[PDB]
Write a protein that binds this ligand. Sequence first.
Ligand SMILES: NC(=O)c1ccc[n+]([C@@H]2O[C@H](COP(=O)([O-])OP(=O)(O)OC[C@H]3O[C@@H](n4cnc5c(N)ncnc54)[C@H](OP(=O)(O)O)[C@@H]3O)[C@@H](O)[C@H]2O)c1
Ligand code: NA
Ligand code: NA
Ligand code: NA
Ligand code: NA
Lengths: 499, 499, 499, 499
Amino acid sequence: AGLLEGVIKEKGGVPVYPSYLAGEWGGSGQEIEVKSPIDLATIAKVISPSREEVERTLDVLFKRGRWSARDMPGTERLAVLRKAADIIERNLDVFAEVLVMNAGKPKSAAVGEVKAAVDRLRLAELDLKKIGGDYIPGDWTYDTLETEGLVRREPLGVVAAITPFNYPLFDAVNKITYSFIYGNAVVVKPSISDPLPAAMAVKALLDAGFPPDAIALLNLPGKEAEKIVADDRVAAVSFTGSTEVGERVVKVGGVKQYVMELGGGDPAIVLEDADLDLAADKIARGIYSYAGQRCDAIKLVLAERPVYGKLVEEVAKRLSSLRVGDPRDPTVDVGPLISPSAVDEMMAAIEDAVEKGGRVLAGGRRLGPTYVQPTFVEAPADRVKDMVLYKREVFAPVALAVEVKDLDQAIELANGRPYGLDAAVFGRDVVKIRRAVRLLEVGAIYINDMPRHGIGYYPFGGRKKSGVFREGIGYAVEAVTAYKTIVFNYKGKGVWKYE
Amino acid sequence: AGLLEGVIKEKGGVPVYPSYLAGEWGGSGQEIEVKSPIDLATIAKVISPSREEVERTLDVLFKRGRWSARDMPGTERLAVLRKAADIIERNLDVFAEVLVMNAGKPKSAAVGEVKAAVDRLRLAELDLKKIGGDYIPGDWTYDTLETEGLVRREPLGVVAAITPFNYPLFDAVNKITYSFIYGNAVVVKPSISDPLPAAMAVKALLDAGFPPDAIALLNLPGKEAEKIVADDRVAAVSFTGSTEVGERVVKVGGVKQYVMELGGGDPAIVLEDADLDLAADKIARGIYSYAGQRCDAIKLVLAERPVYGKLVEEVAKRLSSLRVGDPRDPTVDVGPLISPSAVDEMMAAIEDAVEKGGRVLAGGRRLGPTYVQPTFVEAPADRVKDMVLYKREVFAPVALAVEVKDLDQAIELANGRPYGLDAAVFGRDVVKIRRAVRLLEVGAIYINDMPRHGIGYYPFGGRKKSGVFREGIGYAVEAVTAYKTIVFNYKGKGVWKYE
Amino acid sequence: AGLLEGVIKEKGGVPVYPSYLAGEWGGSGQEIEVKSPIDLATIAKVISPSREEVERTLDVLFKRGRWSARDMPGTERLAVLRKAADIIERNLDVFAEVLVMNAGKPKSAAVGEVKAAVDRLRLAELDLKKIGGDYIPGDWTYDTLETEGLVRREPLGVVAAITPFNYPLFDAVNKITYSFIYGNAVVVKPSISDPLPAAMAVKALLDAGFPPDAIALLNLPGKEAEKIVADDRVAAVSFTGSTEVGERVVKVGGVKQYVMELGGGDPAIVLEDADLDLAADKIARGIYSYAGQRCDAIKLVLAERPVYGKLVEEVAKRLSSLRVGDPRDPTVDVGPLISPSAVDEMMAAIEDAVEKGGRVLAGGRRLGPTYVQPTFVEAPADRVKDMVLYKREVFAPVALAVEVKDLDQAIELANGRPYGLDAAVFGRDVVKIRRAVRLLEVGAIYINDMPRHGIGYYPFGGRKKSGVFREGIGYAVEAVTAYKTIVFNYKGKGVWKYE
Amino acid sequence: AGLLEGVIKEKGGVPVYPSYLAGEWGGSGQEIEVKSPIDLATIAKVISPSREEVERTLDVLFKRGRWSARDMPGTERLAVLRKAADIIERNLDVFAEVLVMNAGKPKSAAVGEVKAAVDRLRLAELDLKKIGGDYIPGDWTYDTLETEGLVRREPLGVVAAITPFNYPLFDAVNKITYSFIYGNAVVVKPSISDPLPAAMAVKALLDAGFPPDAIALLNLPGKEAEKIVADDRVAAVSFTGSTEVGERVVKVGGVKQYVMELGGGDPAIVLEDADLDLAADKIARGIYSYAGQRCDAIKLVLAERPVYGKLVEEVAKRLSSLRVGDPRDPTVDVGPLISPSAVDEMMAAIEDAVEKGGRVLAGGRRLGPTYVQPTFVEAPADRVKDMVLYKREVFAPVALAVEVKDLDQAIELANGRPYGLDAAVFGRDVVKIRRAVRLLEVGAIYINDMPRHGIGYYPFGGRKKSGVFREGIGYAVEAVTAYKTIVFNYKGKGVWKYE
Ligand SMILES: NC(=O)c1ccc[n+]([C@@H]2O[C@H](COP(=O)([O-])OP(=O)(O)OC[C@H]3O[C@@H](n4cnc5c(N)ncnc54)[C@H](OP(=O)(O)O)[C@@H]3O)[C@@H](O)[C@H]2O)c1
Ligand code: NA
Ligand code: NA
Ligand code: NA
Ligand code: NA
């Protein structure tokens, strides 16, 4: 309704969302139920495209889309993105409501994501900061004398944007924005769990002037998307999700440009130096925000001997003084988890930690099929490494607390997990901070703040199992664009006189 | 002998080359024969490492190598590379001889490759031109106010360098150089066809001071290398070879940083504008150099109506006035092809073209199991697209000639092949050149010269089936290094006063 | 009136414009008459500040202005500039009218300048493209081992913007924009001939939120401004004007950062290669626009033997088929010159050329105290160098035409003038274009178009007598900002382990 | 002798050094005595060029030099610089001896400067890191659609390098290096006090292949150099010296590119946070090195209440435990000052401080016409600002010590001097360091180390009275090079299809 006026179809009491096939909304494949984690009820259905529609869509994106995007000058592409931002902003309440219902996101966080999407589109002007190239004069080698080089970038063509469930709106808008601003066409494949915010974002872009044959939104479940990733007309794949699916995506994709944001959690380190009030506050937030369903959620806290006591005590208080339930009461702090399955995994991970010597300091109580209390588990350094909570990413509001003798042990334990997305360090001493900055094997280190990618104002991405490459204003150009070198030969042509 | 004094083992009349296991030369796996394309005779044997030695080597590279390379300051790494250059240069004749014998490379081209390897090492100082980073002040967004960002690069750790047969020495030295200069350890896996130049380059590096536990040279045949690519301790794979193996490599590798130089041939375009003498000369060279066993070899010539006649006539004359045989007579122009199998493919591709309306303008005659004349085949535009010589890369001295009505048809035929490595354009008119530069889908375009990557003074790499990412002085840092972002939070700390 | 509602004072029938003293509009110094070149009539008066008000203003800019600008975060500075753009745009007709009346600018050119000013402000977002810095790791020298460097930019403080008469509105808005976006305070000193557009731009900026104590507009005549340039609180001087005043400005200023755009005219070269229709069209425009009162006006045309005839013939036709008179009839092409004195100089320069063998091909007739026909004077190469029109910049619609044997003579004659602002080259051949690009000693070379700085989308500035440094989106940051290096010492601190 | 074999002329027992006139050594102007501060004895004479020789030299540099430098490809320029480094290095003892005798430099510091000069030349390869340019695509504005921009740098032509007495060798080699590597010709004008090291450096460069008509060395006393600075053939002036002469230089020069390193001293701040042992050590060194005749010498120490006592006590001990006398005994720590006049100024400045409430904590005793003890004077915050030692730069081994309540007072007192070259901050807390980094108005801030420009590995330069622009590896290109923009117009030419 409203923005999706003539798109959505009320059939049998439940709104039915079609796929956008690079020209027209539609689809003739199986219909799929979309549910809310708030009550496990079916709030909508999405129409998945058939084999033939996928083939036809890719064919349109490749033969026409690449050129519609590329032949639309940057000044107009920018106007399209800014208009889209206006359209989403005036529809703010409706975008937010869908996030709250479809993703189980607390009202204030749902509003924050819509505003992030708006800002991202509006700041596409800043993405131009990394547009340019270089001139390489040839007289620095006898072999290249009287020769000359120009290097610039070019859009790759068709970019596939695969998105996770925890940021259904922002991630799709972000990927669409950086792919399009440089002249690419885009196929969006949102999570089948909450594909609704993506449908709304795309329509807004189409209403804003986005070349109709240069974008596609396909409601394909999991491995149904493999046929898109594996296709030669898709020159790049921008994927945000779990380490496991990412691995499958590259193996199916083969050679192409990839940006793989594979999350995992983040460790946070507290030096005897830290303002514990700031630290406790930021760490508590990092642990529970959106019920820990954030790639940059704090999963492990490492604090030096002299502050471990106070720090862990303060965080525990803050976590237990939270409010669970329905995401609507702006008084509530934590909503549900995307699936009861996710809560099961969390409970099993807490028992594991307890069996291995871990002790719950806050939470630990399941409240429903999709509800749980934010949990903080204390654990001795000599036993934490074998705990599931440490070796894996348990996507939920749960973190471990470990007392350490010094920075070297903190760094060592922080690097001991298989991931390397971000890390946080609270403290004041420049030398210890510099050491941690050099040795933490992660894409980004947050000094005196909890990790927060925001809209990518600062580039972010993983190391180790957390993936490869970065997203960020200006930086994402590297994943959806290729270099083009032009070498000019003026040997013996009289341009230079021996030089 | 000499440089390989105590390494090589004369066993049963044939020198036996061991693998370098990141600490000691050795190996206890199968021994493999290395032959010369000049006479199909066995000139040496290489010892391949066993499963256990591969495992132990990777373990050394990962646990110690990363740190030996990284903890050696750049100033010393540079001294190591410059010393290696001195060592290879004083052993020039011996490095060249091995190239001529093992690769079938003509004396002057073998000398050129050794000199390229020397220059590459010596110019590692220029690779530093892309060392730096940026400062991202946070006051351009209300959300990032009193915040601040630092972005820099870091070596990934262990880089796997897989190399082709056509540049056994330069490619290994190039990959080792750019991986090491930034602080990485490296596993080199050369072609099992001519692994000898690599063994000599590595020893020279080791004699020059290259951290002994930071490099490895494994004589593994084809799929034996898969276990290296698939290992999690290998953070990046730099591969130069065929499209097919590259595809297999990524599928085995999964998520990691990749530089894939997958070759294919290059098209060359001649406008009615061109100096035909320069064009004929450069195109003839591009067609026959090293018996067309160059990724940047000219495989297709497209010339406008008014110059097609003269141009094709001049190139034919130049190709037929060449001399085949043994690579030793500096009077000789073309040596043998790496295998008789490669010549078979070439002959079958020439008949195919003839059957589809193609006509031989020069060459076409096989001279031996590994010898053939450089061939130039004329073909009508309306039938060339289905010819094997057009649809595939026939690694041999053979190119098609096609008359075109204008630039648009030239561009269209040039883009019609599945590859996109380089393209050449001879002509003078700025407008037509700019159009071709924009529309040719290739990593690099050479204006008025045949395509030649040289030592990578200008970055190069593919598009389409030719691969992804670039190699070049300064640019290769992108494939063997990862970004690291440091975000500092000074909110409410009094650094700024509302700004 | 309107925008200047409570600022302007109707006194004795003529509007009186006060100076803005960094806080309040006012002034108690002599009043000065502002006239129109259209009828030599007094259209307004401006109040110049007294010695004391200049001193107090500088004191405010220095003690408070630097901090109001600097402590306003970039996000707000940008909002201020965008609001100012909205305000000027809705007042478009009024800004234009004042330009037509006060500057003698033809209606369509007056509208174009207001729109340029609007775009400049609106695109301040693009100026951020050159914001960043670099990280300089210290391990590339033994002396700097365990050391590290950060380099960034900082606003200088108080920037003095001195502007010419030919672009009274755009130049002030441009200088104010680039100085303010980086955090500087600004003192604007417009030409006393047409200071009205500047007063209107400043008020619009103040209405938009520009820190009131961070900007100043002083109506000081010529050498009265010297006291601003010579003051130590002025850290930078951005000057656009004649070579002579620029020289005086630096000598008075002493050591400080300078951007000196000193104009002079531009030469245009036509190769036998050129599309003469495009060339004739563009060159005619370059000669007459705004009655040649443009720093980038074409003052000399050099065409090779074979096209000289047609080219000069076409330009002559176009120049004589123009319409002079009052700048209001959108049917009119050329308005008056700023002063009768300027027309006198032009007539004397035409006779000089004639006396030295020059022949008028178009125009030559004076129409009034401030009116003249666009003139094109033919001249033999062997005598042109001593003609006033060649050795000087005669700010008027007048250019020389000279036939040349080849490119080398064209380049030589083009470089023979004492200026080096821009040069234009029409032709197609890449080699001849590259040669001209290398040898023309000018800040900017326009290929196949007349020179036009526009809003500085491409940086521009002089060489030789045309000055030093550049203005342009992103580039002007170099003149109003200084570098700041931070070197960190971690020697023996355990950050690095010998590296 | 040796290197200066056939150049120097033994006349009347004292070696006579001629000027190098861009082609031949010689000169026919007045001869001038060069003395040693070690014994006030005449150690040599230099021949100054006559009016005519200055005119002829400039004429050679302009008409031929610019082209000899520019037309020598970068690869050869680099070889020239590296050869020069070899030549100076093998003549190390002789270069050092002359520094010790002519400049009064302690043996170990004289050796350090020769080695700095050698490294500078040898690392000219790193200056290439800032060679490149940018491509500015035109589709981000409707006005620039189908347009395109290339920006690169070009040498200016003839650069004048004026050098101070405190680094007679390094400063000349540094300026010559960065001016020449980019293709400029250079006129060197060394201090008339110690012009000998410059003569030796130039000869070495000439022996190494430096284009003979592209360099000049003129022994002109003070204002005799004005005729070089004021000449239009000199496109840039690189000046290192006092604020006063710098001011005179620009006023004489008028419009041109300038790099003005005007020194002044540096303040050092010690937070209650600092390792006082490191601080005391570094600050003592910063105060006395080369008898404080360093632009980056510490002139003021500001330490917070709790460490002021220990810190000042430690520095005093270190300063008084030094050894004065003759610069030869490697056991000696401090040699003489360049002139007795310089010592007079120092003594008068110490009494002034004492009269205004200052108290000597170390030194204060004059030992001879050119000898003095390193002095440390304590002073109350409420009276220091009016002391000569604070308001001026007393080029000598003398600094003030002031106790401060906190960082804000330290920052305020540090910014209270009229200079702004460098500042040092010792401490650990990131927040206080960041605040000081933002608010100290200086070109460079050294964290936990004394200020040391070294060879310019990190760019350096002044703010306020300390001058404008920077010198440093890579950065100096900005002062001796100008931008060149090439704008290509393809409007309606079919390159782009509406974009
Ligand atoms: N900012 C930096 O990076 C830096 C580095 C090192 C030194 N410095 C500063 O520079 C000064 C160095 O000592 P210095 O005593 O030799 O100072 P200086 O007198 O100012 O040195 C001036 C240089 O300019 C020449 N000169 C003097 N008058 C001139 C004129 N009217 N026109 C053209 N050139 C003229 C001098 O030649 P004569 O010798 O013939 O008079 C000398 O070579 C100190 O204040 C120091 O702090 C700054
Ligand atoms: Na694939
Ligand atoms: Na893998
Ligand atoms: Na001054
Ligand atoms: Na001058």
